Design a protein around this ligand. Structure first.
Ligand SMILES: Nc1nc2c(ncn2[C@@H]2O[C@H](COP(=O)(O)OP(=O)(O)O)[C@@H](O)[C@H]2O)c(=O)[nH]1
Ligand SMILES: [Mg+2]
Lengths: 184, 288, 164
């Protein structure tokens, strides 16, 4: 294979990024995806499997995946940890009882050999809820400050109103483009 | 080429399938017309990305109907394959269905395929890749079967069992279906339940295939290439702690197979590939 | 934050002023009956035994967890169940419902109504013409032909539950 052909292939791969969306069940993982494209969210059903959506944004082709947040669907997340350029963990801010499950899920995902090369985006969804925890409180219960081998970040959003999602996606895309290539 | 300026023609050609599947001259004309229309974007098929879904769904509502005859279903699958060579399967399969109601309808279709029918090889190719895009489902194959002791006298065979018996049979064929069998196992053995159930059986089968096969008998070489491709894909898309336990026996067998001295370029390439796949299972992935 | 925690044989009640877009969480309840009169934003039930919860429309989904011998009657957009046994829910779902680690579950069409109800349905934004109480999905049972042995439609004889 010639250098010219090798370069034509490197460009096509860099033009297509991969973002794996995960998080506990009923955290708005589907609502954010449906709002980021301009679809309707009132007719959303609880996902009983997984979904994929290929969109374009800022000249980048984003193939966003969305896996179920159920326990029987958590033993299969390893089936989507390949060629993942970025990870997006959704957390329910109004949920104060299951705050350790997410902290335990994110810790187990951070010690993954295949996910070491990606940008972490923490979407604290459900902010308009009266009993929703602010970004500072969530940044202390999920143990995000301790992280050092991952370019993480935490921003509060509300999928129903489509607020603060575009800045987060832009930051994620910028941090992903800051690098050159990824590992095999 | 900025956009697809042949949408109406392709739509009409696809719609004419339901009234050209009983013809032999018109069928070939439509095929040759669909080929020359799709070959124009062979150098930049990305321009067809916005159209993929609609054409795919058209070809799907013809092969996903119960009143569809085998002949009509075979033309739709030939068209589907024509769209997967130009866009490629790695990118065109991400849009295929993946709902839990598509696991038994696709395995049952895979169980009415004629392996000796060389004219319908595109059908078998499109079948295996579809069955493989349906092994991503985040559920156990056991939850789907339900109750196996419902048929007295003869118990039904499990979905996972059927898939293991489909992959082993298609991995020793001489057509292009063997390549579709390499993409299926890569998404069948690399899951939790299958890993604990049939990994040892598949490994014994492969070690038996590479312990009895030769690079001289034609079918022997066919058995060698498929097994090496399957092993390479498994070691590439497989977890490192479920695989490292078997890396010691795989290399010991490959060394005795004698591939470097064999007179086959594909076999040696696959052998080097499998050797480099086992080599990284021993070390830890780094991030420079 | 709103709701109830740690109850035992007690009758409760709430109005719309205390449920106008708020998180209602009912944790650790036994032999207690709640009667909500509003349109909460979210509804959750956890660790309920021999309880009887009632509520009007809902803006988001509902979430039951570790409850048994309970009798629910809501009209939400989503309803998720996890580890539930011997429960009779008169739910009105506009999208779909799910039952996980559940058993001896029973369903019926939501029929509860109280004065000043059409108003509560106007602030929630739910489409009253959509009702799929007979199309629940089961994570444990994913067969194509057989019906799950963990949920059942409720007969018309048992649907007549004396609320008052
Ligand atoms: N109040 C509020 N509710 C939300 C928000 N996002 C989602 N919801 C609701 O939360 C429920 C769970 O949504 P869903 O996306 O199905 O969760 P998922 O299935 O884990 O992705 C749905 O009924 C949504 O309408 C939000 O930002 N604010
Ligand atoms: Mg979902």
């Amino acid at each position: 294979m010639g250098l010219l052909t090798i370069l034509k292939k490197m460009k096509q791969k860099e033009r297509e990024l991969r973002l794996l969306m995960l998080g506990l069940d009923n955290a708005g993982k589907t609502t954010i995806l449906k709002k980021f494209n301009g679809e309707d969210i009132d007719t959303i059903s609880p996902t009983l499997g997984f979904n994929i959506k290929t969109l374009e944004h800022r000249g980048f082709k984003l193939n966003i995946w969305d896996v179920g947040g159920q326990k029987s669907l958590r033993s299969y997340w390893r089936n989507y940890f390949e060629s993942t350029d970025g990870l997006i963990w959704v957390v329910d801010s109004a949920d104060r009882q299951r705050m350790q499950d997410c902290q335990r899920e994110l810790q187990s995902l951070l010690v993954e050999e295949r996910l070491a090369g990606a940008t972490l985006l923490i979407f604290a969804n459900k902010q308009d809820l009266p009993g929703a925890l602010s970004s500072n409180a969530i940044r202390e219960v999920l143990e995000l400050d301790s992280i050092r081998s991952h370019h993480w970040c935490i921003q509060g959003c509300s999928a129903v109103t489509g607020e603060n999602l575009l800045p987060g996606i832009d930051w994620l895309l910028d941090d992903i483009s800051s690098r050159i290539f990824t590992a095999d | 080429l900025e956009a697809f300026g042949e949408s109406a023609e392709t739509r009409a050609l696809l719609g004419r399938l339901r009234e050209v599947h009983g013809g032999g001259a018109e069928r070939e004309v439509a095929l040759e017309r669909f080929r020359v229309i799709m070959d124009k974007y062979q150098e930049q098929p990305h321009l067809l990305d916005p159209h993929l879904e609609w054409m795919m769904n058209l070809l799907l509502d013809i092969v996903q109907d119960q009143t569809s005859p085998a002949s009509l279903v075979h033309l739709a699958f030939k068209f589907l394959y024509i769209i997967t060579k130009v866009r490629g399967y790695k990118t065109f399969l991400r849009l295929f269905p993946h709902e839990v109601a598509d696991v038994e309808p696709v395995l049952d279709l895979v169980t009415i395929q004629n392996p000796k029918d060389h004219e319908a090889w595109e059908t078998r190719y499109m079948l295996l890749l579809w069955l493989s895009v349906t092994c991503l489902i985040p559920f156990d194959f056991s939850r789907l079967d339900g109750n196996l002791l419902t048929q007295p006298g003869q118990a039904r065979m499990s979905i996972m069992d059927r898939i293991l018996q489909i992959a082993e049979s298609y991995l020793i064929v001489s057509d292009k279906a063997r390549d579709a069998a390499a993409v299926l196992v890569s998404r069948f053995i690399t899951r939790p339940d299958v890993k604990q159930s049939k990994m040892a059986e598949f490994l014994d089968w492969s070690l038996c295939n590479l312990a009895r096969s030769s690079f001289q008998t034609m079918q022997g070489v066919i058995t060698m290439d498929g097994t090496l491709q399957a092993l390479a894909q498994i070691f590439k898309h497989g977890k490192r702690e479920d695989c490292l336990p078997y890396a010691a026996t795989v290399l010991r067998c490959l060394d005795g197979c004698r591939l470097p001295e064999s007179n086959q370029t594909l076999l040696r390439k696959l052998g080097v590939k499998l050797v480099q796949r086992l080599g990284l299972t021993f070390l830890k992935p780094k991030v420079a | 934050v709103c709701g109830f925690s740690n109850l035992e044989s007690q009758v409760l009640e709430k109005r719309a002023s205390e449920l106008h877009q708020r998180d209602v969480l009912l944790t650790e309840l036994s032999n207690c009956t709640v009667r909500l009169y509003g349109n909460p934003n979210t509804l959750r039930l956890t660790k309920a035994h021999s309880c009887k919860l009632l509520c009007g429309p809902v803006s988001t989904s509902v979430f039951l967890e570790d409850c048994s011998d309970c009798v629910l009657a809501v009209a939400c957009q989503q309803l998720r169940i996890h580890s539930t046994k011997d429960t009779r829910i008169f739910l009105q779902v506009t999208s779909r419902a799910i039952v996980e680690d559940c058993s001896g579950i029973q369903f019926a069409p939501y029929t509860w109504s109280y004065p000043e109800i059409d108003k509560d349905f106007e602030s929630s934004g739910l489409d009253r013409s959509k009702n799929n109480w007979n199309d629940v999905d089961d994570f444990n049972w994913l067969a194509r032909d057989m019906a799950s042995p963990n949920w059942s439609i409720l007969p018309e004889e048992e649907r007549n539950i004396q609320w008052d």
